[PDB]
């Protein structure tokens, strides 16, 4: 791996991974000790990933301002009808096929409606470089407002927008969320990956070991929580209520 980016899990434990300075993206089956590089084409410092139930992958190609998908056994990936973008950093997909983008370069997250492909733009304000996207169940987008070092939210429909009690916040570069509400980032220029659990107000930093710079964040419904370890070019993981990391085996 050489500075990993983006990282995405399904209900299966498949784990999904930017190689942003290989310009690929990778792929590691539960159990499995080696991985797979999936067929994309003429990718350029890829930033997000997104998986569906169907094993569709959608990836951020921030080099070429585009955002691009494989079904799976594939081998013709899709250019997605996404107009404007600017180095997109983040990607986040819902069960009907509505994709969410985080178009970093212009401060700004563009939603695709299913099937119409009509482009809309989310009433955030204020956001400064955005990167990381997440979308929960109930429809609600989480952006880490990079350049703000804050992370806001927003309900489907909404014109509140609101910012997630984080404290402290440097460059935060992912989001990740599950079925509780519970909301994990990575702190990327603190080196740390912080937690607002469900109901609580006080943030929790996860007992990973020698992180640097990290860079996305993914969580399933066993409350697993992966994490692109961009600095040291490795991705590692922690089991719900863990203090001792996995690194996983890409290479």
Same mark, same amino acid.
Request: hydrophobic fraction near 40%; aromatic fraction near 4%; avoid cysteine.
């Given at each position: 791996?050489?500075?990993?980016?983006?990282?995405?899990?399904?209900?299966?434990? &498949?784990?999904?991974?930017?190689?942003?300075?290989?310009?690929?993206?990778?792929?590691?089956?539960?159990?499995?000790?080696?991985?797979?590089?999936?067929?994309?084409?003429?990718?350029?410092?890829?930033?997000?990933?997104?998986?569906?139930?169907?094993?569709?992958?959608?990836?951020?190609? /921030?080099?070429? %301002?585009? =955002?691009?998908?494989?079904?799976?056994?594939?081998?013709?990936?899709?250019?997605?009808?996404?107009?404007?973008?600017?180095?997109?950093?983040?990607?986040?997909?819902?069960?009907?096929?509505?994709?969410?983008?985080?178009? /970093?370069?212009? %401060?700004? =997250?563009?939603?695709?409606?299913?099937?119409?492909?009509?482009?809309?733009?989310?009433?955030?304000?204020?956001?400064?470089?955005?990167?990381?996207?997440?979308?929960?169940?109930?429809?609600?987008?989480?952006? &880490?407002? /990079?350049?703000?070092?804050?992370?806001?939210?927003?309900?489907?429909?909404? %014109?509140?927008?609101?910012?997630?009690?984080? &404290?402290?916040?440097?460059?935060?570069?992912?989001?990740?969320?599950?079925?509780?509400?519970? =909301?994990?980032?990575?702190?990327?220029?603190?080196?740390?990956?912080?937690?607002?659990?469900?109901?609580? %107000?006080?943030? &929790?930093?996860?007992?990973?070991?020698?992180?640097?710079?990290?860079?996305?964040?993914?969580?399933?419904?066993?409350?697993? =929580?992966?994490?692109?370890?961009?600095?040291?070019?490795?991705?590692?993981?922690?089991?719900?209520?863990?203090?001792?990391?996995?690194?996983?085996?890409?290479?």
């Amino acid at each position: 791996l050489n500075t990993p980016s983006g990282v995405a899990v399904d209900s299966a434990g &498949t784990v999904w991974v930017t190689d942003h300075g290989n310009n690929r993206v990778v792929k590691l089956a539960a159990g499995s000790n080696t991985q797979t590089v999936l067929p994309f084409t003429g990718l350029n410092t890829p930033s997000g990933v997104a998986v569906d139930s169907a094993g569709t992958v959608w990836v951020t190609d /921030h080099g070429n %301002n585009r =955002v691009v998908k494989l079904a799976a056994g594939s081998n013709t990936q899709t250019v997605l009808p996404f107009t404007g973008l600017n180095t997109p950093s983040g990607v986040a997909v819902d069960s009907a096929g509505t994709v969410w983008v985080t178009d /970093h370069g212009n %401060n700004r =997250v563009v939603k695709l409606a299913a099937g119409s492909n009509t482009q809309t733009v989310l009433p955030f304000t204020g956001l400064n470089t955005p990167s990381g996207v997440a979308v929960d169940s109930a429809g609600t987008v989480w952006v &880490t407002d /990079h350049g703000n070092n804050r992370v806001v939210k927003l309900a489907a429909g909404s %014109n509140t927008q609101t910012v997630l009690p984080f &404290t402290g916040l440097n460059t935060p570069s992912g989001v990740a969320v599950d079925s509780a509400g519970t =909301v994990w980032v990575t702190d990327h220029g603190n080196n740390r990956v912080v937690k607002l659990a469900a109901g609580s %107000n006080t943030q &929790t930093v996860l007992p990973f070991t020698g992180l640097n710079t990290p860079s996305g964040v993914a969580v399933d419904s066993a409350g697993t =929580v992966w994490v692109t370890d961009h600095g040291n070019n490795r991705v590692v993981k922690l089991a719900a209520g863990s203090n001792t990391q996995t690194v996983l085996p890409f290479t």
